[PDB]
Amino acid sequence: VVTTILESPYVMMKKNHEMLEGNERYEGYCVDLAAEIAKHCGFKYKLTIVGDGKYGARDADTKIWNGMVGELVYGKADIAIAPLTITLVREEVIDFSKP
Amino acid sequence: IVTTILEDPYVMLKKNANQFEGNDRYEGYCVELAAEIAKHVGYSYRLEIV
Amino acid sequence: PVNLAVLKLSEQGVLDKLKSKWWYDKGECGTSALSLSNVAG
Ligand SMILES: NS(=O)(=O)c1cccc2c1c([N+](=O)[O-])cc1[nH]c(=O)c(=O)[nH]c12
Helix, strand or coil, rough: CCCCCCHHHHHHHCCCCCCCCCCCEEEEEHHHHHHHHHHCCCCCCEECCCCCCCCCCCCCCCCCCCCHHHHHHCCCCCECCCCCCCCCCHHHHHCCCCC | CCEEEECCCCCCCCCCCCCHHHHHHEHHHHHHHHHHHHHHHHHCHHHHHH | HHHHHHHHHHCCCCCHHHHHHHHHHHHCCCCCCCCCCCHCC
């Protein structure tokens, strides 16, 4: 399972998405970046969009994470290849790769 | 123990290095970086050139 | 503790102030009409 997020330049939905089911529905930089990763990694990728439409931030009241970050900690998502900023609080909960 | 190399504004020996002892025998950028992290993590250090 | 300390320094802005000091603060450097000097003669 590969969790991503909808952006303008990164993850775009292609024209005639109804006539192409699977990984042909999307096209962009972040799609090809995942293919480069799976060139040297033994993993099967499925383009799964996060339902919330959020990057990840722990709310003040609930004290619980959401989106791609929320799916990582609670154990649903496997890998996340998306424009995600590497900050202090994220490193405490989930491990990050090199920039 | 800290391992480092001498090159330009990162690490260079202090003025009148003859009359200096320990960490007060060096000055630069990485000098100040070594000082900051040692406090936040919590251990005393000793600078040494490669 | 070191990896997180590096992130603690960067986000708050310790490195950026320190980089300003040793490069610039400790440094020793620093209309297109017809000018007056061209006609001065
Ligand atoms: N759309 S945006 O104007 O540029 C933009 C604005 C504000 C926050 C963003 C953000 C983008 N982004 O590039 O899509 C990614 C991103 N990733 C994170 O992890 C995060 O915390 N905040 C952001």
